[PDB]
Amino acid sequence: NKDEYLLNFKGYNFQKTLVKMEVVENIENYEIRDDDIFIVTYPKSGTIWTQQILSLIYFEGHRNRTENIETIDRAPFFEYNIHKLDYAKMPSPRIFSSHIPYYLVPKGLKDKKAKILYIYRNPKDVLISYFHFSNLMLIFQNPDTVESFMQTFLDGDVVGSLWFDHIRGWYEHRHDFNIMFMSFEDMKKDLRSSVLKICSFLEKELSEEDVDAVVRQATFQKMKADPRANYEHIIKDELGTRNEMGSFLRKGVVGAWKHYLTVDQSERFDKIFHRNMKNIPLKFIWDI
C-alpha cells in the first residue's frame, strides 16, 4: 500500500511518481554552475514562499508583472521536473528547489561556489501542514488521524524522511557548503529584513522600491491571490487533488498546531525534539 508512494534511495524517501530512479542515480554527478542557487527545505516549511521571493528578486519581469510565468518555472524542483524543463539550457543564474538531504547533493555543490538557502520551520506546524497537504494531494498517501500521521511523520515514512535527520545533516555539515539558514517564522515576523538578508547572502542588489514590491507580492494574502505563485493550477490540473476545496496556501500561520496536538502528543514530541536538537543553535519560534 505504501511502496507505490515512496522511492527509497540511500535511506531517503523521494516521491515515487514524480522522479525516476534514473535521475536520482544521476544526481551525484550533476553539473553545477558557479552561480547556481538552491532553495533547500524540508517539505511544508516555506518552499514555494521562497520560490516566490527569489523570483521577485531575480526576475524583474515577474516583479514588474510584464511576465506571467509560474514560479515553478523560475525555481523548478531539482528532483521533481514535472514541467520537463531542460535544466541544462536554463539561463544562469539558475534557481532550483529541493528537499534532498546533505549527503545526496551533487558533488558540485561541495565546491562552495553555488549558494544554498536552507529554509526551516518549527516541526509541529510542519507536521500539521504536511498532514493537511497529504489529505489534499494525490501524490501523497492519505492519512487518517492526526495521531496516526504524527506516528508516520516521526517514523520518517513520508517524502523527505525524518525531519530531524534532514535538518541535522544540513546543519552539522554547514562547512561543506556555501549556505545560509533562515526560518519560516522569521520571514513571517519581518518579511522585509528577511528579504534583505537573502539579497545580502545572494549578493544581489535591489533598489528600495524593488524591495517594497518584493515584500508586497510575497505577503501571504497577496501571494495566495497570485496564480503565478499560489500553485493552484499546478495542483488542480497537473498533480491532482482529492477534493477541490483545499489550497497550497492554506493558512500560513505560526502556532496553529496548538489547535491539533493534545498536551500528551506535544510533550512526547518535545522529548524527541530535545533528544535530537539540544546541540543545534538555531532559534525556533512556536507561536504568533
Ligand X SMILES: Nc1ncnc2c1ncn2[C@@H]1O[C@H](COP(=O)(O)O)[C@@H](OP(=O)(O)O)[C@H]1O
Ligand Y SMILES: Nc1cccc2ccccc12
- Which spans of this chain sit near ligand X (rule: CB under 6 A)? 41, 43-49, 125, 129, 132, 188, 218, 220, 223, 249-252
Q: Which residue has the cell 539540544?
A: 278
Q: Please state, in angstroms and rounded to a whole number, the distance separating the CA atoms of residues 287 and 109.
A: 34
Binding mask 191-230 for ligand Y (x = CB under 6 A): ----------------------------------------
80 touching ligand Y, by CB under 6 A: yes
Selected from 7, 36, 38, 47, the binder of ligand Y by CB under 6 A is 47
252 labeled part of a ligand binding site: yes
**Nearest Cα to 115, choosing from 192, 197, 191?**
197
Catalytic, out of 62, 99, 132, 166: 99
The distance of closest approach from Cβ of residue 141 to ligand X in the complex, given in angstroms and rounded to an integer, is: 16
What is the C-alpha end-to-end distance of the chain, expressed in Å? 38
The distance of closest approach from Cβ of residue 48 to ligand X in the complex, given in angstroms and rounded to an integer, is: 4
**Nearest Cα to 53, choosing from 167, 197, 248, 232?**
197
44 labeled part of a ligand binding site: yes
15 labeled part of a ligand binding site: no
Q: Which residues pair with 84 in a beta bridge?
A: none
Q: Please state, in angstroms and rounded to a whole number, the distance separating the CA atoms of residues 260 and 170.
A: 29
Selected from 39, 114, 136, 159, the binder of ligand Y by CB under 6 A is 159
99 is catalytic: yes
Q: Which residues pair with 97 in a beta bridge?
A: 39, 77
Tallying the residues shown for the chain, one arrives at 288
Q: Which residues pair with 95 in a beta bridge?
A: 37
Q: Which is nearer to ligand Y, 18 or 196 (CB)?
A: 18
On whether the CB atoms of residues 7 and 24 are closer than 8 A, the answer is yes
- The binder of 143, among ligand Y, ligand X, none, by C-beta within 5 to 8 A per type, is none
> In this structure, are strands 37-41 and 95-98 parallel, antiparallel, or unpaired?
parallel
110 labeled part of a ligand binding site: no
Q: Which is nearer to ligand X, 26 or 193 (CB)?
A: 193
Selected from 15, 50, 134, 194, the binder of ligand Y by CB under 6 A is 15
> How does 179-196 read in b/e, with b if 16+ C-beta sit within 10 Å?
bbbbbbbbbbeebeebbe
207 labeled part of a ligand binding site: no
Name which of residues 108 to 137 contact ligand Y (CB under 6 A): none
Residue ranges binding ligand Y (CB under 6 A): 15, 18, 43, 47, 80, 99, 159, 239
Which residues are tagged catalytic? 99
Residues annotated within the binding site are 44-49, 121, 129, 218-223, 250-252
